[PDB]
Each structure stands twice: as C-alpha cells, then as structure tokens.
Design a protein around this nucleic acid. Structure first.
Lengths: 218, 134, 260
RNA sequence: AUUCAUAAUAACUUUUCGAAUCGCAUGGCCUUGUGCUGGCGAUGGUUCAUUCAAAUUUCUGCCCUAUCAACUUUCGAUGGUAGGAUAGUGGCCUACCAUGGUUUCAACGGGUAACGGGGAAUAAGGGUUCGAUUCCGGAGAGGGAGCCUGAGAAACGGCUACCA
RNA sequence: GAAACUGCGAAUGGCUCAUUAAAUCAGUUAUCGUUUAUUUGAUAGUUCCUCUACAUGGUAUAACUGUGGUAAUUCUAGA
C-alpha cells in the first residue's frame, strides 16, 4: 500500500512502500483531516506526525472530503469542487468516488508532514525545492520583502536568468497594479469628463427653461 | 499572325484600394489564344505599370475565335499590389510563395486528437514514460 | 426555434436589393441597427452591387476596415451595417458624398450630392415624449433621440438633424401644401403634395396626395415623409423628381433615348 | 382611450448602479514639481428609446366518416371574487361560491397510406389530382420525463433517471 | 507567441416529416398584457461621512514545477 508523503516546509515529495499488515494497522478508520503518529508505521518515522490528506483505492478512484461509509458511491458533482472538472457551463456528471474513511481496500494513501521527528529523511527533509514564481502584484512584492509605501518596488523584482545557447539574458515579470502616470491621467480624464458633461447638461436645461418662458409670454 | 490588339473598356478608378479596374478584350485574329503574360506586359506599357504590379484574372474566348474578353485591374505601387490582393493570385503570378500544409483530413485529425490533451502533456508524457518503464 | 436567426437566404432577401438568384445561396443579412432589415440597405450591397468598387466580400471588408466609409459622419467597419433611408454615407478618398433616396421604380438609388448639403439629414419624428427627469425628447425613424426640442414638434412630422451634435435646426409642420416623399407599399418612391388627410380613429389615417401631374392617390400615414414646402424641398430630389411614368410613355421616352 | 409619460410626499431594501480596466499619442501651464492639466480611441455601465427577436392574441378559412347524436363537469368543465405562479394576460393552479359551455349551421368520437402554405400536373372554361422535397412557418433527434448554464434551450455533435 | 484563466459563441445552421384535424398554417389585427444579450441614440458633480489606502484594498487558483493510482475514459488524487 503505497504512501505519497509530502513535506510542504520545503515542498519535497516522495513515495514509500510499506508491505506489512501489522505495521499499518494504526491507519484504519481515519478520515482525511485526521492526525496520526509516525511511531507504529516506521522506526525511521519516529517523532513524525502525519495528517491524512488523500488517496486512491485499488480501482484508482479518488476519495472525497466529507463522505463517510468507506465504500464507493456515485455523486453528481458540480463546478468548483474536487474530483471533477467541468467541460462546459453547468455540466454536472455523475462520477463515482470513494469514502474518505481509510480502509484496507486503499491502494495509495497521501500524507502531509505536520511535525518533523527527531531524525530526518534522506530524500524528503534533506531535499528542498524553490518556488517556481515570485510575487507579481506590487503590494504582494511589498508584503514579500517587508517594504514601505515609498520604496519604489520596481527595483526589488526577481530577474530570472536564461542562456539561449550562449548569449545570456534575463527577464522579470511585469508588475501589476502599479502607480503610473497613465493611471493618474485616466483618473483625471474621468473626473474632468464627468464635471464637463454635467455642466453642459445644466446649461442646456437652463436654456430650454428660458426658451419655454420666452414662448409662454403671450 | 500580324498582331493582337488590347482594348480596355468600362474603366473605373477605385482610390479606395488605389487601383483601376477594366474589362480587357483582345482581338487575336489568327494566333490561338491570349498569352496572358504578354497582356500583363502590354498593360504595363499602356499606362505605366511595372508588370509585376498588374493582375488580369477573368478571361474567356468568344465562340469562333478571334475575340477574348476578360476582367483585369492595375495597382500602382506594387507594395499595395501585394497588400490588397488575394494570396492565390499573387502565387499565380510568382510574387509570392505557396505554403505547404497537410490536407484537411490530417489537420482535422490532429486538432481532434489534441483536443484530448489538457495542458502541454508534459506531465502525461513523463507519466506514461515512467508507467511503461515499470 | 430556440433563439434568434443569423442567416438570411437568397429568395428571402428584400426584393429591392436586386440580388441575383444564382451565384451564391445566401444574402447579406443586415445586422441590427437603426433600420429594419426589410427596409434597409447593408454596406456590402451598396459598395459591391451598386458602385462596383469591391468585387468580393473580403474586398469590401478590406475597403471598410481601412476606416474609409462613414455613415452619418461616423466611421463604420461592419460589412452589414444597415444604412437606411435619408442616410448620408460618405467616401473620403474620392471626396464624394451620397444620400440614400428611393428611386421612382421602387428600389434604392445612388444620389450624388455636393460637399455642402451633405452635413444635414431629415428625419420623420415618430414619437415625442416627456422623458426621464422631466426632459422632453423626440425620437425619429432612424433611431436618433434628441433632448429638449421645441414644443411645436409634434408626432408624424419632420425635423432636420444636421450631423455635428444633433441640435435640431429649423423644422417643418405637417398639413396641406407640403411636399411629401412616400416610402412604403405600392406607391413607394413617389413625391407629391398633401391635399387631404382623413383621420379614422382606431387606426391607419389614410392620406390623399396629389402629384406634380395631377394623379391623386392615397397611402397610409406610416409611409408619408414630409420634406418641406411645395416647390422647395430641403434636400436635392433624385433624378426625374418622382413622377411615376406609366409604361407606355416609359416606352416612348426610352426609344426617344435611342438615336444619338 | 387609461390609475399613461413624468413629477411630489412619507418611508422601506440580506442597498442594485454611480469605472481600483486597457492601447496609442507627448500637447499646454508655470511656483519647474518628475506639480497642475490635456487628446485620439478600446472595454464596461443603470435606465429609457431603437433594432434583432420572442411569447401570447382578434376575425375568417381545412380531407373522409352519422354502421359517431349527444358531448364536457367524480379527478376545472363555463363563469365570479381573492390569492398563488409566471416576463406578463388568463381556471394557468388553489380556496370558496355559482350551473353553466358546444351542437343537425354536424358538437363529441373515429379514420388518414395528413406536417401547413407559396406552389406542380392538367391548355375552352369551371374544375379533378398532387404538394415528403431548393423559399416561409411548425415539430423532433431511439421513447418518455426532468433540469443546469445563459439574453435566448425544456438543448440532445449538454447533463441526470427510467425503458428498449 | 504554445498552454491555461477571462469574454463571447456553441439556442444559428444542416437533416427529417414520426406526431398534429381549429392543432399547425395563411391573410389580418393586438400588447393601454409583456421579456429581449446584441446594434444604434441619449443618459449618472449627490456613495463612508462628527478619526479613514484614492500616487490605487485583499484573497486565491488554473496553466506551471515536481509526487501518484487506475486494464480502461476528454478519469483524476494529494503538495
């Protein structure tokens, strides 16, 4: 029964193989979201604490958060939920899915480290991976670097490097939601447009009213 | 044969496209037919046109030979002749290049096969390599 | 059938487009705009089948989308923008101006006009109403709405929108002694003077119109379009001045044409 | 032709809308601040009108059959009031109350090898027969029902259930 | 300039004639009995306010990276 382990502190992922029915007995009758200990599952995993995250049965159907009765049932899934991706607007297929209570018929179970043990893992704790993309919004830049409101965050943007075959050059993300003379100019134009249109309406209404009074002088 | 004669009728100036449109008719009392490129060169030396900037497209010989009537149009400034013109005719006069593409069935089959891939398939390719490895 | 309709086949197009029944199995289908498609004229028909400028559909697409042809002093890029009656389509690269006025026989005509007089346009005011916030507004046959009109503009009448900002200049009344265009039914395209209007409460006030040559007739009031004083129309009338010749003297003048 | 358009008062609302968007241009002002202002467009946006439509709707018009003369109303049939529901009228439904409605001027039932029309064949006429089929309108995606999304679908080159 | 998000379209076409006998349909009206994205024309100095970002608030999530199951599906799980 394979075990997909993840360590989100550095974002490292691995697969482990446990093939004894007695060293896995502690895993039964727990739903996803529960917490187990790394003692009885492995002497290497002493001190480690796991949270049960997800998994797949022998047939390969996933497990759904919430549903009890660890059997396989068919559910009519809609947009913006797990286990389904809609093909067109409002499509709701009836997909079959497994209960979140872990039983013996599971084939793969996926866990998240919530507390590192006293010893470490060769391919998990030692290994670390960078995040693929830095922050893109300017206020997110400020929040990432801990900056001020007068700091001009365009100079702190991460510029990733690349070599085509020999000629090295870098590129950096286009900053979004920035203060810019274009935006101030557009806001200025909006205000001026509103006040000019309103004044034109007022003076035309006054001209119409005095025309009516001129007409009714008979 | 002594000569053909080329007469342009119903001449319309179209500055919306910067061109002139006309009905050519050629009297070829003996030869066989038009020799269309000679008409292109002739219409070039008629106005002033730099014969790669002209195009005559419609032609049909009258019954019993002699007279052939068609539609032809001249662009000034051969850049606009490459601009406002369909690509098949520009390939036909050698001022362009025909692209090669797979036929309609192969293009439709390729589109309807990569409709079955969500994303680049790099995960799918890597996964299938790993899963047929063992 | 489950929604709107986007195709218009040949044999279902308006007859006065003079569309050839072969060489294509579809008609332009004028997209929505100021006029009804049964009484409009798309840009593609006008530029392709009348002045012979374009030859294909993509040809007039490339003419238009170079931002050339302006309808009512505004640049249009749509191939089937429905230019309708009394519209003032203008071409910039030829310095030519046009005005859609119906021919005597019934279909649309190509009426060349000077650069002056192309800056105004008549419109039959169809309903006048006290609008939102207590302002008065007129809305005419071409979909234009004008706010703050003179109180004397009443229903079924004519105003004169120029092109610049609306702002209706001098307008016309509606009575006997006024020149009148007709734009619907059997007596389409005929210009004459109102002699009488009989009002039937409940609908369809018929109008008695006397032409130039004392051929009286009647139409419904929906087709009447008053264009000014008798003998003084504010536009340039089309060729022939709307007489509706009978076919016998049509034969007479047409063989009078033959011979030099 | 109106309790219309519109305006006013008293309030009310899981307070709707009233631009945190984008391209191209480098104009003008001086206290010369990288301060103030400014163009040509793009995309949205509430309401009203317009256009494309939609849905209901008045009058009149269909083939054969009396070996079909009574039909409809238990379980809405025709009408009244009031509510509910709908985009809205309306027995469309519900509660209560009335006993009506159609017909030998053919009701109701039955049959159709019936989708309807523009139209086609047939040259003395009027007619007799045809119109599944190039255009207009309706209905349906093996049979039924239900429904999400959307301005617009009871959609099936969308979904769910049952039947084959 | 792939992929994916967002917007729109996919309710038009095209096919067939099984149902249907005042039903459809045709001419003729009606909406003072209503819904309508789109197009066209007009349209919005009033917003929290007896202490406050307006030289501009916050969260996610796809695509992506890497970890996997299923014989199989335009299956998808967890990070």
């Amino acid at each position: 029964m394979k075990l997909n382990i993840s360590y989100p502190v550095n974002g490292s992922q691995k697969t482990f193989e446990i093939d004894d029915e007695h060293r896995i007995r502690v895993f039964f009758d727990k739903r996803i979201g529960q917490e187990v200990d790394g003692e009885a599952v492995g002497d290497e995993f002493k001190g480690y604490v796991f949270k049960i995250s997800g998994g797949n049965d022998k047939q390969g159907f996933p497990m759904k958060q919430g549903v009890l009765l660890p059997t396989r049932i068919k559910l009519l899934l809609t947009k913006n939920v797990s286990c389904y991706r809609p093909r067109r607007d409002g499509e709701r297929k009836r997909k079959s899915v497994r209960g979140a209570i872990v039983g013996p018929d599971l084939a793969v179970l996926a866990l998240v480290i919530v507390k590192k043990g006293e010893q470490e893992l060769e391919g998990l704790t030692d290994t670390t991976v960078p995040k693929r993309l830095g922050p893109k919004r300017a206020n997110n830049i400020r929040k990432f670097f801990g900056l001020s409101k007068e700091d001009d965050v365009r100079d702190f943007v991460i510029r990733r490097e690349v070599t085509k075959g020999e000629k090295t050059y870098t590129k950096a993300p286009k900053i979004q939601r920035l203060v810019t003379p274009q935006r101030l100019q557009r806001k200025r134009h909006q205000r001026a447009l509103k006040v000019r249109n309103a004044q034109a309406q007022r003076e035309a209404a006054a001209e119409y009213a005095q025309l009516l009074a001129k007409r009714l002088s008979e | 044969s002594d000569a053909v004669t080329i007469r342009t009728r119903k001449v319309i100036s179209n500055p919306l496209l910067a061109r002139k449109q006309f009905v050519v008719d050629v009297l070829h009392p003996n030869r066989a037919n038009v020799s269309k490129d000679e008409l292109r060169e002739k219409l070039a030396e008629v106005y002033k046109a730099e014969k790669d900037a002209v195009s005559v497209f419609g032609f049909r010989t009258q019954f019993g030979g002699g007279k052939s009537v068609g539609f032809g149009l001249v662009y000034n400034s051969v850049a606009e002749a490459k601009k406002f013109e369909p690509t098949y005719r520009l390939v036909r006069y050698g001022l362009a290049e025909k692209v090669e593409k797979a036929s309609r069935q192969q293009r439709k089959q390729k589109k309807n096969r990569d409709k079955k891939i969500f994303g680049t398939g790099k995960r799918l390719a890597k996964k299938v390599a790993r899963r047929n490895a063992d | 059938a489950r929604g709107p309709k986007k195709h218009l086949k040949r044999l279902a197009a308006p007859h006065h487009w003079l569309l050839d029944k072969l060489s294509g199995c579809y008609a332009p289908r004028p997209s929505a705009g100021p006029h009804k498609l049964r009484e409009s004229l798309p840009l593609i028909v006008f530029l392709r089948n009348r002045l012979k400028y374009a030859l294909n559909g993509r040809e007039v697409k490339a003419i238009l989308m170079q931002r050339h042809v302006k309808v009512d002093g505004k640049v249009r890029t749509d191939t089937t923008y429905p230019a309708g009656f009394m519209d003032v389509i203008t071409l910039d690269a030829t310095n030519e101006n046009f005005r859609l006025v119906y021919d005597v026989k019934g279909r649309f005509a190509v009426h060349r006009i000077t650069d002056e007089e192309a800056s105004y346009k008549l419109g039959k005011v169809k309903k006048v109403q006290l609008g939102k916030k207590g302002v008065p507004y007129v809305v005419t046959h071409d979909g234009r709405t004008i706010r703050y009109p003179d109180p004397n503009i009443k229903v079924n009448d004519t105003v004169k929108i120029d092109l610049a900002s609306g702002k209706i200049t001098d307008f016309i009344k509606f009575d006997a002694g006024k020149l009148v265009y007709v734009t619907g039914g059997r007596n389409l395209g005929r210009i004459g003077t109102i002699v009488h209007k009989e009002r039937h409460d409940g609908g369809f006030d018929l109008v008695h119109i006397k032409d130039s040559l004392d051929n009286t007739f009647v139409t419904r009031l929906n087709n009447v379009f008053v264009i000014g004083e008798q003998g003084k129309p504010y536009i340039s009338l089309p060729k022939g001045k709307g007489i509706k010749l009978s076919i016998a003297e049509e034969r007479d003048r047409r063989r009078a044409q033959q011979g030099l």
